[PDB]
């Protein structure tokens, strides 16, 4: 506060690293500085203090290109860390690291701003007990339930409808829990960011003329590493506002978390720090910790993060994924093979995992049903391979009732999303947690052993299954009646 408007002069410029000399003393670390001299630059220049070289000289990382920058150029402190707008006015808008609207849709008109860097919640602010996050999706809420204050790794690239799942989660969380969402594109292709924005506007999650339920914060590849290493924190700060001020269950999507690690690695290299194993920065654990720890469920609200993970060289022991996986409370595997099987959401139930799959957290009935489903699916795999050498006619009648129930389960874990009510034409479903548990529990026992297999395909709940079966029966009867006439 006492360093608001303090004046300094540029002393050194080496790539994206700039050293500034202040006669009155360097401001605190992580302070933001603005280069007043915009002589020939097409964009404003802002620097972030990262180190102190002496009592008067300070090293900083430029968030934009340092072209047309001369020594002794004037610089003015902003009075604190980078400030980002927070409030309900940021919904449906696109921002950058500096919290400037890049959608060319008029002024934001915020009422408050918050610093990018904020300490994580103290041990006394943690939630009393773990709670489940009902996403409205049968598979996620049964075999790998999400958790409030949890970080969930969405393994699996594109071509598997990853964006559709993200949009559905954004819609369902607001629909059920009344919590907003913040999407952070770290080192993301500019083309894909445009496509995501158009899809969101098409699905009405971002209603220009109405009320939106999602914020976007994009730090693209073409931006220097100083920006890609702070965009996530800016988005996290926006979510923190809703978590604390409004007390909500917010969502924070990160695409990807690896790009965040890579950006900090590049920044550390520029400063000249000695890299650790596999060329990563020595502060790899600390950089992730200062971010993930801020993502937790407090006494006011919660922030559940869905982070898209990328494994370099398909090596799961690499320090980046290895350090990341230690912070993840759930895994969602998206596979093309399942999508090519016509199962959307394309989720491999046996490849996913979750830590709250314990009776001490979820209801005992939920845990028993989930384990029974997993066991049945695992048995269905071995039986599938047995019939390859034998033929289904050989299998025992226990193993031919278990190969019939399993197929119904696989078809029943698919679901039509409301986000695709337009481009697919089928009304979406939002299956409640209790409804899913009861439906699967009944199916496992064998109550629905007469319903046709296809009645479970792309349906929500058990009532939908009955309605589809009746329609199928009516259609079959009409066709048979017409055939008898001719």
């Amino acid at each position: 506060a006492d360093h608001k408007g303090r004046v300094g002069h540029v002393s050194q410029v080496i790539g994206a690293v700039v050293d500034v000399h202040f006669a009155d003393g360097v401001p605190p670390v992580l302070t933001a500085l603005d280069v007043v001299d915009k002589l020939g630059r097409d964009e404003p220049l802002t620097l972030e203090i990262v180190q102190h070289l002496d009592a008067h000289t300070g090293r900083c990382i430029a968030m934009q290109t340092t072209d047309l920058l001369k020594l002794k150029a004037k610089v003015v402190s902003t009075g604190g860390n980078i400030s980002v707008p927070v409030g309900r006015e940021t919904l449906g808008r696109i921002f950058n690291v500096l919290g400037d609207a890049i959608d060319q849709r008029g002024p934001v008109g915020e009422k408050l701003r918050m610093p990018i860097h904020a300490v994580a919640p103290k041990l006394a602010d943690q939630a009393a007990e773990d709670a489940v996050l009902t996403t409205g999706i049968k598979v996620i809420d049964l075999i790998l339930p999400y958790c409030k204050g949890g970080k969930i790794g969405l393994f699996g690239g594109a071509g598997v409808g990853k964006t559709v799942i993200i949009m559905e989660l954004i819609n369902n969380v607001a629909k059920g829990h009344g919590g907003f969402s913040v999407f952070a594109g770290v080192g993301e292709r500019t083309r894909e960011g445009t496509d995501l924005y158009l899809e969101m506007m098409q699905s009405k999650v971002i209603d220009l003329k109405g009320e939106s339920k999602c914020v976007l914060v994009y730090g693209q590849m073409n931006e220097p590493p100083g920006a890609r290493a702070r965009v996530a924190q800016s988005a996290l700060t926006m979510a923190e506002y809703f978590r604390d001020v409004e007390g909500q269950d917010v969502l924070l999507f990160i695409d990807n978390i690896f790009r965040f690690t890579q950006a900090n690695s590049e920044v550390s290299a520029l400063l000249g720090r000695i890299p650790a194993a596999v060329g990563y920065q020595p502060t790899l654990a600390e950089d992730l910790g200062q971010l993930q720890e801020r993502i937790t469920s407090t006494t006011k609200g919660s922030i559940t993060s869905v982070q898209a993970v990328y494994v370099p060289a398909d090596d799961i022991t690499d320090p980046a994924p290895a350090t990341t996986f230690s912070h993840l409370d759930a895994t969602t595997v998206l596979d093309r093979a399942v999508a090519e099987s016509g199962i959307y959401p394309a989720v491999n139930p046996l490849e996913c995992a979750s830590r709250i799959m314990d009776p001490d957290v979820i209801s005992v009935d939920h845990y028993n049903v989930a384990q029974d489903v997993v066991q049945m699916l695992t048995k269905y795999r071995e039986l599938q391979d047995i019939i390859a050498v034998l033929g289904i006619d050989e299998l025992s009648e226990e193993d031919k009732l278990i190969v019939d129930r399993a197929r119904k389960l696989v078809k029943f874990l698919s679901q039509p999303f409301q986000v695709a009510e337009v481009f697919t034409g089928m009304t979406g479903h939002y299956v409640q947690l209790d409804d899913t548990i009861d439906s699967f529990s009944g199916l496992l026992m064998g109550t629905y052993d007469q319903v046709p297999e296809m009645a479970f395909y792309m349906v929500g709940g058990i009532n939908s299954v009955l309605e589809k079966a009746k329609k199928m029966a009516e259609e079959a009867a009409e066709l048979e009646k017409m055939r008898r006439a001719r």
Binding site: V13, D19, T66, K70, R189, Q220, P225, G272
Partner: protein, 530 residues
Amino acid sequence: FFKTTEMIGYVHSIDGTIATLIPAPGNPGVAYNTIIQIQVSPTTFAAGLVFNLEKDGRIGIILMDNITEVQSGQKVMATGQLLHIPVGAGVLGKVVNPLGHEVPVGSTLGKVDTGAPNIVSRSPVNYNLLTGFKAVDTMIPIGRGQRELIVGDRQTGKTSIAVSTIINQVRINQQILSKNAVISIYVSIGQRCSNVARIHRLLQSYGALRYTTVMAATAAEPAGLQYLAPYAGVTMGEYFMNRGRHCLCVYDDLSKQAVAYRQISLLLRRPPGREAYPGDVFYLHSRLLERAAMLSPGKGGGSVTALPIVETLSNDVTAYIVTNVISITDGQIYLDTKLFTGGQRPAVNIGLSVSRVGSSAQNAAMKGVAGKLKGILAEYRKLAADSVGGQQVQTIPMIRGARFVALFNQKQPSYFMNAIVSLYACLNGYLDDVKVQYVKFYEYLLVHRDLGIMYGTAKNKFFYMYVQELNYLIRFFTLNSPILHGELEEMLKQHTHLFLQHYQSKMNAIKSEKDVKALKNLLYSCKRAV
């Protein structure tokens, strides 16, 4: 002639192509990443680029030309301006240095360091860009504004694909309006001057220089030039993008650029990273490829299509540079050595090749054919997995997969009508009775000949393969349309019947020592004729 403004200092040290300057009296300042002129001779200057601004006043300089004339103690002047190169329709058909100087062979100014379009200024990729190859246009679509990598090992056919793509646009730009014409910019980096000349002759033979420009930073040119060539190349291409036109930039190749940037950084004492590359290498490539985009209709609808080329040593895609480029581009075309030596040319490994854009970058006719073509080939590979012994059984999916994998063998790019028709014929089973060895000959007769007219049996009124102007009708109306579907099937049926009756019948009856050789030569010629 870069315009010098003031003296900023004197040369102090020289380390090959890297120099340092000490400040002049009064310690005048120089803008970062700007151009300077070193007075090598009384009336001659050497170009240099500012790279470092040390605290003590020393300046790091990357030399660009006339390095042999640079000596310590010489005078340095500054231009105070970024690098701007000539651009416009007046540069097409010429060899140009990254500094804008023309290279002798035997309109406005553009900044070489400019930002990419923002999110709101872009549009989805829908317009296709035809490479002229059936494999690429079908399994790995490329759309205008897309960034498609070409990754492969040495001597696998990387440069050929890009050159053919540039050439394939000549026959199209001549017909349609210049608005939709595709202007090509081929950037040679760290190559030989001989290869540039041969490429220049090759383009001139097909008349592509009228729509193409070549930017060369060859070996024996200082690393500084090799590091700026791609940026200058896009700057030439961005001129057309900001004016509602389409451009195609090819980089051959980014592997050598990264080495040059590494050389510059290390000689200037910058913190090295993995494989000794600096920490800005990823940023270097990203800000280069991200400048290739597809502008929205509100900004003219122009585009820049990027085709970076990368050399993978020993089929290792785990290298630092390769991974970074792959993580930036929108897909990749993988050229495999074994297929290249196996007679499959182009050697695209469709299993490892991908296009994240997808069918959106395909025409209606191509999209319909590809929808079924992709499915068939997968079954052929899976059944081919059991073809290692066991006497693979020829089901219809295999009977058609083999023909598809034999039609993909070509030397020169194929006109859209010829390619789409041939794929459609193989898709509907017209080649089931044609042996795999004679497919190329069958295609050649279909394209360059007309059996129906030869035997006086053709009944179609307009649909003939010699009518090269049907291509745009096919593009507007898919082959699966009543306007063209009826005549198309009639011609294919008639051509197939005549071929089996007359030609293949004689081929199966060849029994001699010279006829067999003549047949073998004919098949090989047809293999590289279409």
